[PDB]
């Protein structure tokens, strides 16, 4: 039976599986579409994690459930995959000053995710070290090749008009890399107050700058974004993918597809 890796959520599953190739099985705890910040694990998840040889998670306070869940797991090592990530801080709300956990939305950060996951796989399954090393380098080259198409895809939005209005403030790392000012209805997924007041502050920012499009994301409700759309007259741009891939048969089966689809959907929103 092959070396088994279990990850907290789907983005890490797909990156690790590319590095693992056919010498290791990598599975996600959270299923596609499920909210990952305050996920409530199930009996299935304990059995799945307990059957793994290694458990990977994001850290940076992403999985608020993980440490309690990991208590119920005996004699399975865990490894965070975000060593060396430079955090962007959350700037408003009850989590101000905590790291924004969504670092994988920058493809240059994905190279660090790859290196950290390569290091963990090699450390815990050294028999397959050269497969992990070969796959990690090959996959890293795939990530590097995205920068040119992605920039070209957004090249038609003039710099002054690059406002990214979303529901969760989950795109800070992507926005910083591609010169977007970010606007959001809540800084991070959580049980929290202040969203109704922030909804009106976003409406003011949209009206002030005549921002033409707003978005929601695949693991949360589209209702706040559509309410903002109706009240401002801005177009509802659809669903961006940050916290989860789709199923393998859906439109966003891989991490590369997530970056491309999100950037494409954004550019579509500004299309004239
Ligand atoms: Fe999130």
Q: Quick one: 71 and 106 in the same domain?
A: yes
**How many other CB atoms sit within 10 Å of the CB of residue 167?**
25
Experiment type: X-ray
Structural domain harbouring 265: 156-272
Query: Using CA atoms, how far apart are residues 213 and 64, in angstroms rounded to an integer?
Result: 31
**Surrounding residues of ion ligand 1, Cβ less than 5 A:** 170, 189, 243
- Residue whose token pair is 């559509």: 226
CA distances from 155 to 144, 151, 179, 266 (A): 18, 6, 11, 12
3-state secondary structure of 238: strand
Same-domain check for residues 162 and 84: no
Q: What is the DSSP string of 68-110?
A: HHHHT--S--EEES-TT--PPBP-SSTTTTSBP--GGGSHHHH
Question: In sequence order, which residues have a C-beta less than 8 Å from that of residue 105 and are 6 or more positions away?
Answer: 170, 171, 172, 173, 174, 242, 259, 262
Resolution of the solved structure (Å) = 2.0
Annotated binding site for Fe(2+): 37, 102, 168, 243
Q: Considering 155, 175, 195, which residue would you say is the last residue of a domain? A: 155
Tokens 């509802």: give the residue: 236
For residues 146 and 259, the answer to whether their CB atoms sit within 8 Å is: yes
CA of 134 to the centre of ligand 1 (A): 31
Identify the domain boundary among 96, 130, 155: 155
SS3 117: helix
Tell me: do 121 and 36 sit in the same domain: yes
């Amino acid at each position: 039976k092959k070396f088994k890796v279990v990850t907290t959520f789907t983005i890490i599953q797909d990156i690790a599986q590319n590095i693992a190739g056919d010498v290791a099985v990598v599975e996600s705890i959270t299923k596609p579409g499920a909210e990952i910040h305050d996920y409530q694990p199930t009996p299935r998840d304990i059995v799945k994690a307990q059957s793994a040889d290694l458990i990977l998670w994001n850290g940076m306070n992403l999985e608020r459930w993980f440490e309690k869940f990991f208590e119920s797991i005996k004699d399975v090592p865990s490894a965070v995959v975000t060593a060396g990530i430079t955090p962007l801080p959350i700037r408003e709300g009850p989590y101000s000053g905590i790291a924004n956990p969504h670092a994988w939305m920058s493809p240059s950060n994905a190279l660090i995710y790859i290196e950290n996951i390569r290091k963990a796989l090699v450390e815990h399954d050294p028999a397959h070290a050269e497969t992990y090393n070969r796959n990690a380098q090959a996959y890293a080259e795939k990530i590097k090749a995205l920068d040119a198409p992605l920039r070209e895809r957004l090249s038609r939005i003039p710099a002054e008009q690059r406002w990214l209005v979303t529901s969760e403030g989950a795109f800070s790392y992507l926005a910083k890399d591609y010169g977007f000012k970010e606007v959001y209805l809540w800084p991070i997924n959580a049980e929290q107050q202040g969203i109704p007041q922030q909804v009106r502050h976003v409406i003011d920012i949209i009206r002030e700058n005549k921002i033409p499009v707003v978005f929601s994301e695949s693991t949360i409700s589209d209702k706040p974004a559509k309410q903002v759309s109706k009240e401002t007259g801005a177009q509802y741009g659809g669903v961006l993918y940050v916290d989860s891939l789709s199923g393998e048969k859906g439109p966003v089966p891989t991490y590369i597809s997530l970056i491309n689809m999100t950037v494409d959907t954004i550019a579509k929103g500004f299309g004239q």
